[PDB]
Amino acid sequence: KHIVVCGHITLESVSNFLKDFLHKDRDDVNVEIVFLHNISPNLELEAPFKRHFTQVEFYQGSVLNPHDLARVKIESADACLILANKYCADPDAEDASNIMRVISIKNYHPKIRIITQMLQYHNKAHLLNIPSWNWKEGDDAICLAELKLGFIAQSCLAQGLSTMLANLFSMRSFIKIEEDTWQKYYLEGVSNEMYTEYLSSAFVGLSFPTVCELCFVKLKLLMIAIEYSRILINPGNHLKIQEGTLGFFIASDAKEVKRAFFYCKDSNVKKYDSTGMFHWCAPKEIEKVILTRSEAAMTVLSGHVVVCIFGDVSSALIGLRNLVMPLRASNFHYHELKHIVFVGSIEYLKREWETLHNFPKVSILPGTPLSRADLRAVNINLCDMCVILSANQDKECILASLNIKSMQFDSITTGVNIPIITELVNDTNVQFLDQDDDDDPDTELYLTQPFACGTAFAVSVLDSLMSATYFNDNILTLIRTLVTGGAEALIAEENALRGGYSTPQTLANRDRCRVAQLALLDGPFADLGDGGCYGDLFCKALKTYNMLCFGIYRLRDAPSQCTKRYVITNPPYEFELVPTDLIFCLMQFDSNSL
């Protein structure tokens, strides 16, 4: 068996790909990895790969040449993977070049499975016009803008979620440490992966919550979703398991997951898009949402999302709707929607506005993330999250967080505990975000403190999704569903959310779970918070509320003034809680909430 890898083939991308792929591949003895690359080969370590990896072949050529497709044997290849140049100055041109690759490959052999990266959502949509593009039969498009900004969006609801999800398809060996440090418990959580498996016929007729509890208690498996088709994430009491239901699980090894299969014994007004999946308003002219610094200072905002954008009129477009849209999912109540305030170049942001103008509660302060006056005007110290992004052309981004941290407010307080997530292009630059951690350029991103705490994200963590998708493309579908707020045909044609009137059928689409974070200082889980065990909390949340818990966000220093928290995914039943812990969970929509 063999796969063909093409597109952006460099020493960096080849090595990174092989690292992911060969960690996950259980039958690597019998799988040939064939790289096809355009320019002549400088033995850019072409030779070393030939030593280290004896099942890795290189071919000079293009997937646009039918003879080169015959030379690498596309007709009998298990899949063709297309790596994008993620940092291209012109994402539309890069996407078009990869769509052309798909067209050429599919012309040569229609039934070849293709997995491709796409930079922008609007280009992903063009693949549907290729007749032989068959997503049902395994053709996959990994959209980088959609996923990266989705991961970030959900992290505005529960900080650390981006890290947790990333680590569920990180294909690295579990690493152990003996001492009782924060790293120990983080690393126990890192060993988890997402799997799918059919549910035992013995579960048929039982409710998801019942089966989920049985999996947790009896099998030590965390089941998060099912598919009869679309994926239901933590469905409630009324949803019963049918024959041939596929379960989605989080576990330490694939062997454990097998137990789940073998188990024995308002009416006149348009307020939503036409599907009822997202909040929607009539298109506003950008002048209606632009604030001056004085105007912004008059309205005190709190619980809001401040989005700091580095970029000028000439920058490549980010696709900011990929951030905003999940934060406008219809399974949020209008009143709980987080106000989004963009701080950056108005001539940049004017170019994004066409695909943002139907989302409510969006403001723009023309200015710069480095201006303390702008940040004070938008109440940076009271926000639920500050997101720091750069448009395509790290030091600007890093400087902005350092600047925020050192600001003083109001007893005067610093900005050191302000919630921030910074997008980095270069993994190495994670070293400069925190001043109280161990730095090393050779240490991978996932082990660093900013990543472990969910204060840094890089599109590079999505690279491993390519290998993950090859081995199990249900994992991509789950991740996309979770981070985008749920889902496409109408958007593929129009490239815009059309408004629509509410019916019973469109309003029923509101009833799906949302990401949230549970505190343990008071309320019904406080007794368990005080030295109780995670498993009792999990069962109580699930039985009483159909609330599914999937980890802890724990204080690094659980005497200390540091409020930094790190992710602990899928902890065991007996794991001991502390009162300051926050719990990652999926909560049911509550229609009567007020």
In the complex, which residues of this chain contact Ca ion (CB under 5 A)?
431, 434, 437, 439
Q: In terms of CB distance, is 414 or 428 closer to Ca ion? A: 428
**Smallest separation (angstroms) from Ca ion to the CB of 149:** 26
Determine if residue 32 is labeled as part of a ligand binding site. Answer: yes
Determine if residue 431 is labeled as part of a ligand binding site. Answer: yes
Q: In terms of CB distance, is 147 or 424 closer to Ca ion? A: 424
Q: In terms of CB distance, is 449 or 588 closer to Ca ion? A: 449
Alpha helices, DSSP H only, in 424-525?
449-452, 464-471, 474-484, 489-494, 504-508
**Smallest separation (angstroms) from Ca ion to the CB of 174:** 25
Of 421, 335, 413, which is closest to residue 384 (Cα–Cα)?
421
Determine if residue 517 is labeled as part of a ligand binding site. Answer: no
Phi, psi of 348 (to 5 degrees): -70, -55
**Smallest separation (angstroms) from Ca ion to the CB of 29:** 41
Q: In terms of CB distance, is 434 or 463 closer to Ca ion? A: 434
Q: In terms of CB distance, is 243 or 557 closer to Ca ion? A: 557
Q: In the chain, what is the greatest distance between 2 CA atoms, to the nearest angstrom?
A: 73
**Smallest separation (angstroms) from Ca ion to the CB of 447:** 13
Structure tokens, 546: 């159909």
In a 3-state reduction of DSSP, which class is residue 87? coil
**Smallest separation (angstroms) from Ca ion to the CB of 424:** 13
Determine if residue 55 is labeled as part of a ligand binding site. Answer: yes
**Smallest separation (angstroms) from Ca ion to the CB of 310:** 21
Determine if residue 439 is labeled as part of a ligand binding site. Answer: yes
Under 8 Å between Cβ of 286 and 363: no
Of 541, 544, 536, 543, which is closest to residue 573 (Cα–Cα)?
536
The CB-side HSE value for 570 (13 A sphere, CA atoms) comes to: 25
Calpha distance 144→251 (Å, rounded): 26
The residue written with tokens 């220093």 in the block is: 557
Residue type, 418: I
Q: How far is CA 151 from CA 155, 387, 462, in A?
A: 6, 12, 10
Q: In terms of CB distance, is 348 or 451 closer to Ca ion? A: 451
Residue type, 242: Q
Of 245, 163, 183, which is closest to residue 211 (Cα–Cα)?
245
**Smallest separation (angstroms) from Ca ion to the CB of 439:** 5
Q: In terms of CB distance, is 104 or 431 closer to Ca ion? A: 431
* Residue stretches of the annotated binding site for Mg(2+): 32, 55, 57
* Residue stretches of the annotated binding site for Ca(2+): 431, 434, 437, 439
* Residue stretches of the annotated binding site: 32, 55, 57, 431, 434, 437, 439
